[PDB]
Amino acid sequence: HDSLLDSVGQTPMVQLHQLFPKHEVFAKLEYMNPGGSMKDRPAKYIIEHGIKHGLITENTHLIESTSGNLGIALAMIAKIKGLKLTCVVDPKISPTNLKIIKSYGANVEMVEEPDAHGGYLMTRIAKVQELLATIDDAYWINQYANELNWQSHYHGAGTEIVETIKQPIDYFVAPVSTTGSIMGMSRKIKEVHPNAQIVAVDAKGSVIFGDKPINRELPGIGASRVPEILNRSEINQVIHVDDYQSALGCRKLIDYEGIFAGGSTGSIIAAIEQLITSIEEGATIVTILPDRGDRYLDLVYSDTWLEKMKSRQ
Amino acid sequence: HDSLLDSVGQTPMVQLHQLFPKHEVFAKLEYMNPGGSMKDRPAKYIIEHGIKHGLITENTHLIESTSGNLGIALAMIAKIKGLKLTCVVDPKISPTNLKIIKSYGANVEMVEEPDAHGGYLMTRIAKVQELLATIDDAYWINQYANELNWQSHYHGAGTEIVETIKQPIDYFVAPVSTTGSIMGMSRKIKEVHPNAQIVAVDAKGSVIFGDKPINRELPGIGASRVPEILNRSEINQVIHVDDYQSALGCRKLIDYEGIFAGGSTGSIIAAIEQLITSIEEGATIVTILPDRGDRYLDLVYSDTWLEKMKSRQ
Ligand SMILES: C=C(NCc1c(COP(=O)(O)O)cnc(C)c1O)C(=O)O
Ligand SMILES: C=C(NCc1c(COP(=O)(O)O)cnc(C)c1O)C(=O)O
């Protein structure tokens, strides 16, 4: 490979035999991408597209609002391409992920005022618009509305999944924030497996699917606005999980399978444990594990954080 | 794959075009192994061997003295195999790596008394012998003396390198602690490229190759005893680098290539920059990048740690 860019994708798939002994449950390890998450795929895809089409030159200042993983992916790619980048972030970001963005030489704008229900997305978007107003040659990645987001997953893990799974897929389960992953992957999966059931896993208190908004702790799952790239008619079921439940799911996965994953992976485990009680034995379930446990030592893998979240419920 | 075990190995190789524009410098990304370092390979190899040969059963308590990466690899594998594990560690371990070992459910023994020159290896070995004396069914991985260590690298990255590089290899450069990586990989490389020059990169103050021992900060490179698996006649050149120089090398690599790697990778960059002044333009240099930058935010990627080390020199 001529660079790191060439090592994005083609991630491993494993079966979770120990955790789910009566079902065929397969997990795509997207956290093994070089930047450390699934978001490596939309970052590569959007930036290469923009350069090809004259939207992004060496003078273009990239801007994005992120809970952490897309900021890290964008900063890696920007280093390789010689581009400037400013990440707009909020106080809920993983402290580890905030320091990583800075080590990659990205500019950081940290907002401080949440809305009436604890969410910082409205304030992040406003900060982005302010940066756009004062930076002459700037390009907003705009992941909640950019069609290239779900397209990158259609061609990425979505395609790899249907190339690799040698049996009918009964359920596809994915966590949501922009819904790029689940829209893109499900669209590819259903071309081959048209009766596959599509299950979104979301945070309790996320308005994506119409919950009453409430303050959420874990970054990366859930949102306080409805993403524009979501098409609700393509989702068959929604399951909501809270911060405490997601943390328990992380800790059970590492105990049962030796897999050390981030918060939204815990949300997926907790949701699949709720789902399988209804599912015929032997059925095939496919999911994705978006990022690494490494980044959540002050959150999910902190016993005092765990105890704090248990009190909240 | 039936588990994570099956995703160990087959890591990417990239050329460092930007950093070394007049030479062909190839880097094996061993930090992309599932546990996060090269040490995944000896952990898998030694444990599978022991189980196959009746040295390790479900009742066997694994013990090892480690600067961090082998402890993490062993804890991942032990989870998957249902084995008990105690890691003996010292105050120089990365705080992040110490917390990861604990999240994987391993027991931890932290020693506290260094020898006359700041090294903790003598005390770690003593602690290991004490654990051996009081635990009835225990097996010491013993990585500084275990031949299975260098064998795992012969069959691992060593084999992959000679399968992948399509030109004569002029130099092979690797960092050392147990010397398992450099002994194993160089032995395989020289079967195909018998005139390749083998270059060890070591910490200043490491006694591995006979330096006067002095207090070293960065864990993972250097040692305060001579490893038994080292054969000095197989090494052509040795280059020593200090803590500050290694940190500068990490920061230059991420700036030039978008690669975010740990301390010993910085040592490799600093040594290769010293070496190439003597090397014919166009020559092929192969190296390995053992682990992730993620784990060194309180060390190499901390500006105050950086400033502390600059004062020391
Ligand atoms: C919105 C972003 N995160 C998405 C994300 C998601 C949601 O993926 P989406 O494709 O955005 O729906 C799940 N899990 C983790 C760990 C994530 O980081 C971001 O990185 O800025
Ligand atoms: C001795 C151990 N570390 C080896 C190591 C090395 C040296 O590899 P050896 O094969 O032990 O020589 C280089 N770089 C890093 C980041 C390492 O973690 C250990 O993980 O206990």
Side-chain angles (χ1 to χ4, degrees), chain B residues 39 66-67 69-70 143 176-181 220 264 290-291 296:
Chain B
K39 295 302 229 183
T66 176
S67 57
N69 277 318
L70 181 53
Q143 59 174 327
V176 293
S177 188
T178 72
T179 75
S181 296
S264 67
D291 76 350
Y296 298 82

Side-chain angles (χ1 to χ4, degrees), chain B:
Chain B
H1 296 144
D2 297 313
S3 83
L4 219 46
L5 283 180
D6 300 328
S7 70
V8 169
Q10 296 305 326
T11 51
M13 180 113 60
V14 299
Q15 186 178 343
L16 308 173
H17 275 221
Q18 298 299 320
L19 194 44
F20 300 111
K22 298 177 96 186
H23 298 76
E24 303 272 283
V25 184
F26 301 96
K28 182 77 168 159
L29 306 192
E30 280 295 87
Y31 67 77
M32 289 188 75
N33 279 294
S37 80
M38 48 172 31
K39 295 302 229 183
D40 282 15
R41 315 234 195 194
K44 185 172 178 297
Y45 200 85
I46 290 175
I47 289 174
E48 285 184 338
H49 176 279
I51 292 170
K52 183 150 82 77
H53 286 94
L55 292 175
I56 299 174
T57 73
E58 37 269 275
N59 293 305
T60 301
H61 192 134
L62 304 178
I63 307 177
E64 182 58 298
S65 147
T66 176
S67 57
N69 277 318
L70 181 53
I72 291 170
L74 291 170
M76 178 181 69
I77 309 304
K79 257 301 145 71
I80 293 170
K81 290 294 162 56
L83 299 167
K84 298 179 291 290
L85 170 66
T86 296
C87 290
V88 176
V89 299
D90 65 48
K92 296 185 186 169
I93 185 168
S94 155
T96 303
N97 281 347
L98 176 59
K99 285 183 180 178
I100 293 179
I101 292 180
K102 293 170 177 177
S103 297
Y104 276 104
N107 301 293
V108 173
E109 292 288 335
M110 166 77 70
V111 302
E112 290 174 349
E113 300 250 330
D115 65 27
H117 308 283
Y120 292 99
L121 198 62
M122 176 178 75
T123 311
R124 283 205 249 140
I125 291 166
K127 174 60 67 180
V128 167
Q129 298 173 349
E130 185 186 354
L131 293 173
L132 288 177
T134 62
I135 298 172
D136 179 40
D137 190 343
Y139 173 86
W140 178 23
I141 304 288
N142 196 5
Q143 59 174 327
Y144 289 78
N146 197 333
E147 292 273 296
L148 298 176
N149 179 348
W150 69 257
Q151 285 170 8
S152 76
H153 292 304
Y154 177 97
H155 291 112
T159 288
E160 293 170 13
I161 285 171
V162 301
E163 281 178 342
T164 298
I165 302 298
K166 300 315 182 339
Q167 63 219 66
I169 294 176
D170 291 304
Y171 295 80
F172 174 65
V173 186
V176 293
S177 188
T178 72
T179 75
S181 296
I182 197 168
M183 289 298 108
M185 298 182 197
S186 75
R187 276 165 184 173
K188 184 64 182 177
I189 290 174
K190 285 189 62 173
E191 292 178 1
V192 182
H193 310 264
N195 292 317
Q197 296 300 291
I198 308 308
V199 182
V201 177
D202 201 6
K204 162 175 180 182
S206 168
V207 308
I208 294 174
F209 292 98
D211 213 345
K212 168 26 186 54
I214 59 96
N215 180 60
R216 302 177 273 106
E217 286 295 299
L218 285 176
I221 182 167
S224 56
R225 287 284 187 279
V226 180
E228 293 88 330
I229 59 181
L230 175 62
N231 189 20
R232 249 208 120 317
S233 65
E234 292 177 46
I235 310 289
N236 293 110
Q237 289 191 48
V238 176
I239 299 173
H240 298 89
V241 175
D242 66 30
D243 288 309
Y244 182 57
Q245 292 175 295
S246 296
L248 289 183
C250 287
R251 288 159 176 257
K252 193 173 177 180
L253 180 61
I254 193 176
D255 190 36
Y256 276 58
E257 302 280 352
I259 295 167
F260 181 44
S264 67
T265 294
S267 317
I268 286 294
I269 299 301
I272 296 181
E273 290 196 315
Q274 181 175 327
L275 180 69
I276 42 87
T277 67
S278 291
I279 304 314
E280 197 154 86
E281 295 172 0
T284 295
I285 304 170
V286 177
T287 189
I288 51 191
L289 316 189
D291 76 350
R292 305 182 143 275
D294 307 11
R295 312 295 178 72
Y296 298 82
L297 296 172
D298 292 318
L299 306 167
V300 150
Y301 293 103
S302 159
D303 285 349
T304 76
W305 187 90
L306 184 65
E307 187 67 15
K308 193 162 188 192
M309 297 307 123
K310 176 180 178 179
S311 297
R312 304 261 263 260
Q313 81 146 32

Side-chain angles (χ1 to χ4, degrees), chain A residues 52-283:
Chain A
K52 183 150 82 77
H53 286 94
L55 292 175
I56 299 174
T57 73
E58 37 269 275
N59 293 305
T60 301
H61 192 134
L62 304 178
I63 307 177
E64 182 58 298
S65 147
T66 176
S67 57
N69 277 318
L70 181 53
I72 291 170
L74 291 170
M76 178 181 69
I77 309 304
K79 257 301 145 71
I80 293 170
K81 290 294 162 56
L83 299 167
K84 298 179 291 290
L85 170 66
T86 296
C87 290
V88 176
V89 299
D90 65 48
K92 296 185 186 169
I93 185 168
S94 155
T96 303
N97 281 347
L98 176 59
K99 285 183 180 178
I100 293 179
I101 292 180
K102 293 170 177 177
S103 297
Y104 276 104
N107 301 293
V108 173
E109 292 288 335
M110 166 77 70
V111 302
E112 290 174 349
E113 300 250 330
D115 65 27
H117 308 283
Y120 292 99
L121 198 62
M122 176 178 75
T123 311
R124 283 205 249 140
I125 291 166
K127 174 60 67 180
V128 167
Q129 298 173 349
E130 185 186 354
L131 293 173
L132 288 177
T134 62
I135 298 172
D136 179 40
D137 190 343
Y139 173 86
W140 178 23
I141 304 288
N142 196 5
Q143 59 174 327
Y144 289 78
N146 197 333
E147 292 273 296
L148 298 176
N149 179 348
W150 69 257
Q151 285 170 8
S152 76
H153 292 304
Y154 177 97
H155 291 112
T159 288
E160 293 170 13
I161 285 171
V162 301
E163 281 178 342
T164 298
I165 302 298
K166 300 315 182 339
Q167 63 219 66
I169 294 176
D170 291 304
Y171 295 80
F172 174 65
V173 186
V176 293
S177 188
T178 72
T179 75
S181 296
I182 197 168
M183 289 298 108
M185 298 182 197
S186 75
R187 276 165 184 173
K188 184 64 182 177
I189 290 174
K190 285 189 62 173
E191 292 178 1
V192 182
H193 310 264
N195 292 317
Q197 296 300 291
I198 308 308
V199 182
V201 177
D202 201 6
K204 162 175 180 182
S206 168
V207 308
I208 294 174
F209 292 98
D211 213 345
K212 168 26 186 54
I214 59 96
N215 180 60
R216 302 177 273 106
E217 286 295 299
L218 285 176
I221 182 167
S224 56
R225 287 284 187 279
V226 180
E228 293 88 330
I229 59 181
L230 175 62
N231 189 20
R232 249 208 120 317
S233 65
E234 292 177 46
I235 310 289
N236 293 110
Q237 289 191 48
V238 176
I239 299 173
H240 298 89
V241 175
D242 66 30
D243 288 309
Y244 182 57
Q245 292 175 295
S246 296
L248 289 183
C250 287
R251 288 159 176 257
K252 193 173 177 180
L253 180 61
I254 193 176
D255 190 36
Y256 276 58
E257 302 280 352
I259 295 167
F260 181 44
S264 67
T265 294
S267 317
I268 286 294
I269 299 301
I272 296 181
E273 290 196 315
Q274 181 175 327
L275 180 69
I276 42 87
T277 67
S278 291
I279 304 314
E280 197 154 86
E281 295 172 0

